[PDB]
């Protein structure tokens, strides 16, 4: 348990430090549309790793904060700011893939570069405003131990004499809504509309090169616009060379940007679902009144839920090295940079 957290800090600073460097090293006119959200995700994951030496020492001494009041406020604020920001970056990535693949409006009216620049400014402004009450409510002090001080959320500042639970559940449910429920629903809607257009795959002639598009079809021969290639009558031949349906190959479009988007979302959902499910169940446990044995599990699973959420911060650079070919190409170029460095030092 303590050795695992120490490994995350080592893989986080070097991992996210590489991701941030690879995007910045790329040319001004050679940058991808998704790169603006990739760079912002790297900044969010990097600052998330900076809060680990404050959190790991706190867990070692079993809930003890020897840093201060301002450090308890800032670290807790940065943890939640980056919690919303990383989720909003994936929302931007999914919407970027939606506007490009689906295309709801005209190509000139879409403004993909403009929309991306607007979304990145709005997400960083929202993440700071939404996580703002966290910094205000967080304060250091003795709870029961007296000799050992702990950094906790003190609801007494805004709540009345009995509405202390109401604010914990009020801010708690909204955090799951803003940070997971709303972004994941947009993520699911984007993926659904993307798969909807892809559903009817293109077929190309291996003889002449006729690119059959299911959207346009072939109304000159009899194929209605919207007919799938498999739904086409068996008597139909190529309108350019007259070859059978058996001489056509399926267009397996190498959608690399969607592969980076899906993998990052799936891994995020696997690392954010146990943290958000245990939290919501604990908040609902006081209102719905769940059994004594059920609440005992959630209290012991939660410190491990915060562990797997920290894993996601250092797991992302590994995913860029397995599915993204652009990051793999810049990695080899980084060793070539070190090869010219050793060649310039001796010549
Ligand atoms: C803002 O970081 C903190 C700093 C110090 C202590 C903390 O506490 C565990 C957090 N913290 C908090 N506070 S909490 O809301 O008061 C929390 C204690 C809540 O009462 C609760 N829920 C579920 C159960 C079963 C019991 N009790 N919630 N999440 C995190 C967190 C931590 C690390 C990484 C991530 C992604 N998140
Ligand atoms: C203004 C919107 C406030 C959102 C609530 C929030 O940031 O979440 C607090 C959370 O309960 C802390 O653990
Ligand atoms: Zn043909």
Swiss-Prot record:
Lineage: Eukaryota, Metazoa, Chordata, Craniata, Vertebrata
Gene giving rise to this polypeptide: APLNR
Coiled coil regions in record: none
Entry's transmembrane regions: 1-24, 35-56, 70-95, 117-134, 169-193, 258-281, 301-323
Domain notes: The hydrogen bond between Asn-16 and Asp-45 is crucial for beta-arrestin signaling induced by APLN/apelin-13.
Designated name of the protein: Apelin receptor
Subcellular localization(s) per the UniProt record: Cell membrane
Alphabetized UniProt keyword annotations: Angiogenesis, Cell membrane, Developmental protein, Disulfide bond, G-protein coupled receptor, Gastrulation, Glycoprotein, Host-virus interaction, Membrane, Receptor, Transducer, Transmembrane, Transmembrane helix
Subunit record text: Homodimer; dimerization inhibits APLNR-mediated G protein and beta-arrestin signaling pathways compared to monomeric APLNR.
Glycosylation sites (chain numbering): 145
The protein's role, per its UniProt record: G protein-coupled receptor for peptide hormones apelin (APLN) and apelin receptor early endogenous ligand (APELA/ELA), that plays a role in the regulation of normal cardiovascular function and fluid homeostasis. When acting as apelin receptor, activates both G(i) protein pathway that inhibits adenylate cyclase activity, and the beta-arrestin pathway that promotes internalization of the receptor. APLNR/APJ also functions as mechanoreceptor that is activated by pathological stimuli in a G-protein-independent fashion to induce beta-arrestin signaling, hence eliciting cardiac hypertrophy. (Microbial infection) Alternative coreceptor with CD4 for HIV-1 infection; may be involved in the development of AIDS dementia.
GO MF term (any one): apelin receptor activity
Variant or mutagenesis effect after changing residue 79 to A: Strong decrease in beta-arresting signaling after APLN/apelin-13 induction. No change in G(i) signaling after APLN/apelin-13 induction
Full protein stretch here: 31 to 330 of 380
Family membership noted in the UniProt record: Belongs to the G-protein coupled receptor 1 family.
Cellular-component GO terms for this entry: plasma membrane
Effect the entry attributes to changing residue 153 to A: Decreased APELA potency. No change in APLN/apelin-13 potency
Organism: Homo sapiens
Outcome, altering residue 67 to A: Decreased protein expression level and cAMP-dependent pathway. Decreased protein expression level and cAMP-dependent pathway
Disulfide bonds: 72-151
Record annotation: effect of changing residue 16 to A: Loss of beta-arrestin recrutment after APLN/apelin-13 induction. Small decrease in G(i) signaling after APLN/apelin-13 induction
Domain of life: Eukaryota
